[PDB]
């Protein structure tokens, strides 16, 4: 039942978020959206490849791999 209820609650809340944001909150994209990204390890770390909600605490970077 834990998995069932987790799935159902997440589905309902995320679907409500999708509908409300895409119908009512597109006037300011910067306010209602975050810009996120993560790229390959081969390429240098992306500008948006950082943990959200901690932009004022940490600068995230990593060593490239091949």
């Amino acid at each position: 039942l834990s998995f069932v209820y987790l799935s159902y609650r997440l589905a309902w809340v995320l679907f409500a978020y999708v509908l409300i944001y895409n119908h009512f909150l597109l006037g300011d994209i910067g306010k209602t959206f975050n810009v996120g990204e993560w790229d390959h390890r081969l390429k240098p770390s992306a500008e948006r490849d950082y943990p959200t909600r901690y932009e004022s605490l940490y600068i995230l970077d990593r060593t490239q791999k091949w």
Partner: protein, 57 residues
């Protein structure tokens, strides 16, 4: 961005310091510097190579 005491505990990106913070507006049809010349669509009939190239779309 002058006071770090308010910035340190706020769980949001620093875009609040860049979003509509100036009164300087320029209402001229010819001065529209769009997002990027390639951020367009090729109609409901996807026409190539317009549709199939990042250089153009």
């Amino acid at each position: 961005l002058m006071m770090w005491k308010t910035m340190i505990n706020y769980p949001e990106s620093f875009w609040y310091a860049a979003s509509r913070v100036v009164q300087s507006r320029r209402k001229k049809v010819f001065v529209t510097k769009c997002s990027a010349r390639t951020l367009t669509t090729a109609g409901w009939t996807f026409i190539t190579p317009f549709s199939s190239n990042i250089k153009y779309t």
